[PDB]
Design an enzyme around this catalytic site. Structure first.
Site, PDB file in Angstrom:
ATOM      1  CG  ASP A  64      46.246  32.773  31.917  1.00  0.00           C
ATOM      2  OD1 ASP A  64      47.094  33.194  31.247  1.00  0.00           O
ATOM      3  OD2 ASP A  64      45.469  33.700  32.341  1.00  0.00           O
ATOM      4  CG  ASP A 122      42.633  37.390  34.508  1.00  0.00           C
ATOM      5  OD1 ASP A 122      43.867  37.628  34.434  1.00  0.00           O
ATOM      6  OD2 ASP A 122      41.919  38.237  35.002  1.00  0.00           O
TER       7      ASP A 122
END
Ligand SMILES: Nc1ncnc2c(CN3C[C@H](CSCCCc4cn(Cc5ccccc5)nn4)[C@@H](O)C3)c[nH]c12
Ligand SMILES: Nc1ncnc2c(CN3C[C@H](CSCCCc4cn(Cc5ccccc5)nn4)[C@@H](O)C3)c[nH]c12
Ligand SMILES: Nc1ncnc2c(CN3C[C@H](CSCCCc4cn(Cc5ccccc5)nn4)[C@@H](O)C3)c[nH]c12
Ligand SMILES: [Cl-]
Ligand SMILES: [Cl-]
Ligand SMILES: [Cl-]
Ligand SMILES: [Cl-]
EC number: 2.4.2.28
Lengths: 269, 270, 266
Positions: A208, A210
């Protein structure tokens, strides 16, 4: 005689992969490890598997885990971890062979030499200039290139206490500090491994971005799990291909220097 | 059915304000809350009042028990009021800041209910914090502050320090470079635990000083903070009193449903 | 009547230096101090001199003991890493600020469990180190011909490990000049006790922020101290009598008031 501790390393506990499977529950001066140690050979190299966690990263018994691996004769530890990316160039699915960390943990014992365990008497001030084993990292990098994997040759991991994810202000601040990826487990694992004189490296897989990125879906557990489902095999392949290269590299000088560093970091009365 | 937990909210515990006053000492799986819960209605809205420090350092406040208690009482919303230092010239003492972000500088504080030792909270929870404060509640606070004529900042980043000491000047300067706008000792882990409990959380922060980053002004002390609150705390009370009925007549079911889903799907099980 | 607590101050426990020598083991509401207190006079000035990871040192007991013995001043000596090219190993830094990177440490006497210290204390830290004491240290270092920096920000890390290189670089961007493991919470507790606190920091290494030089280790620190520790001892010995003959009553009165009025009660 190399022996490789493996932490969080997907499903290498597989009869098609691991030969001579032997399960083992141990106790340490620091309490029980996270799981039983699974002994066996992978591509003819002695390995010790240990699942890191069900348990929040704050509560994992890192001291017991590393102590156990050391007591079993491990010369190397290779860990695999998911992580958030704090840089556009590190995309979800990419591997980062991290070479530095920034500690944002608060509740974690980071030393065996705590004054209450006389298998570890004295005070230890371990150097952390180069926390990850350079030779192991070089093998990981070279092997990833051969396998055609998306891979970054360096990067700084910020380890947060968790279990919560970071705020957006925190995410932006970590970027200004020089962090490239973010997780919850590298510290104190890396520190304790160095104290034990073990060659430690990490395979970090970005899952991801974040929450710093204004054009993408912010991190959640399901976003992490989805990316791992689509990509975790890459980390497993890297690790499987790397193990025999480690098994046939020379280590006695590297291990001797780590042993000396560990030994001479200890102050006594 | 909205029910508003209120933490640190001045003297709302007043018979002229709070109707049907019911005092109540509760216990939680995490120990005792900071104080007894005071139940009642304020402008026709069910409210639960809870004093944060009862005499207790911010490090020792049982945030887990406080938030658990409010959740167990049926609170859908929590609005907290906090004093804070300003790290920006434009945020003057007496100003209100409706904060939208935080930076955690705490060290001693449990930040989750799901700690492996309480089976009302089994598993591991990784709560998202991209947007830690409830946007709809914040919008109501902002709009209400404008109507009341208050000096109010519509966003800002709170750095929460462990305390109980104030920051050094080098710390104060560093926090400015990190993007912090105001500074306190209590936002974390309160905000985090509220999100885990699926509660709509917002904060009213009132600047009481300029910390110590101006070498050409009076640095923060307890007396400077107390003086500014004496001269200004009624603004925060008015904002909160005027906001409560607006929250009571806003629709929440989608907001609360999304918070519930976020909380629920942040939990990993064996 | 000035009385100077001295922490980590090399070997000032010497009969050639310390006169009415009296060794003394004390107990406090916070447990036992790190060592026995050594009382005596150095030049004409009453002084109190005072294996364990920095995380575990009983700073509360140490400072409480010194306060209970009547100390008005505390001067500490500390080794530290240099985060600036210009602060060379062997240089002294008279630090004036800190950045806290500790995590496990009680930083207050007023913890709700000791009724010699009831209430909650929010001590100001805008100026954590006593300016007058620092001025005397600076002036005395100049007179002694010592390499000395008149200001500097200490980052105190939890330890016992040294910092990573990414941490070392980050601390430089934060404005830290030197790095150690003990300034916090010592400086904080001293202010709570209304004691004039200053620190003599001696650089022993360059941490690990140079990618082209030898990183810090215990042996590098010990080697530099062996080659340099006498400078800190000389500074401290020469400073003590200057402190003894400076006027302090206003300085101490203001510190006392600051401490007193930082305490909130029910
Ligand atoms: N933005 C971010 N900020 C902070 N940390 C992260 C992480 C990493 N973990 C992940 C974990 C929550 S999800 C459940 C974890 C499952 C798992 C399994 N493994 C081992 C592994 C790693 C790579 C490939 C295959 C297996 N590592 N993680 C939580 O403990 C944090 C990812 N993104 C982050
Ligand atoms: N520069 C700074 N750095 C860090 N924190 C602060 C604060 C906020 N409080 C203040 C507190 C110590 S003084 C005692 C305050 C009493 C009080 C009363 N109330 C309720 C309230 C709050 C705002 C408006 C109206 C009522 N909140 N706090 C201490 O707990 C921290 C202000 N400036 C700071
Ligand atoms: N890069 C660095 N990062 C963090 N901290 C340091 C330090 C300070 N000490 C050093 C210590 C590990 S080595 C053991 C040294 C023993 C010793 C002896 N003395 C007495 C002394 C101190 C100052 C001047 C003269 C004598 N102080 N320390 C360790 O406890 C921390 C130095 N460099 C640092
Ligand atoms: Cl992790
Ligand atoms: Cl606060
Ligand atoms: Cl920090
Ligand atoms: Cl130190």
């Amino acid at each position: 005689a190399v022996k490789i501790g493996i932490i969080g390393g997907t499903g290498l506990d597989d009869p098609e992969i691991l030969e001579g499977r032997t399960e083992k529950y141990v106790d340490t001066p620091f309490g029980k490890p996270s799981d039983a140690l699974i002994l066996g050979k992978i591509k003819n190299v002695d390995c010790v598997l240990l699942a890191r966690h069900t348990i929040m990263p704050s509560k994992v018994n890192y001291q017991a885990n590393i102590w156990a691996l050391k007591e079993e004769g491990c010369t190397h530890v290779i860990v695999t971890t998911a992580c958030g990316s704090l840089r556009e160039e590190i995309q979800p699915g990419d591997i980062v062979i991290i070479d530095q960390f920034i500690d944002r943990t608060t509740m974690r014992p980071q030393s065996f030499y705590d004054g209450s365990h006389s298998c570890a008497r004295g005070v230890c001030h371990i150097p952390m200039a180069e926390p990850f084993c350079p030779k192991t990292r070089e093998v990981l990098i070279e092997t990833a290139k051969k396998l055609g994997l998306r891979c970054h040759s360096k990067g700084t991991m910020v380890t947060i206490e968790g279990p919560r994810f970071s705020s957006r202000a925190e995410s932006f601040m970590f970027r200004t500090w020089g962090a490239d990826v973010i997780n919850m487990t590298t510290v104190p694992e890396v520190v304790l491994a160095k104290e034990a004189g073990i060659c430690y490296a990490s395979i970090a897989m970005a899952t991801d971005y974040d929450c710093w990125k204004e054009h993408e879906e912010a991190v959640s557990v399901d976003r992490v799990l989805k990316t791992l489902k689509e990509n975790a095999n890459k980390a497993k392949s890297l690790l499987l291909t790397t193990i025999p290269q480690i098994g046939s590299t020379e280590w006695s000088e590297t291990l001797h220097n780590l042993k000396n560093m560990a030994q001479f970091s200890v102050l006594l009365p």
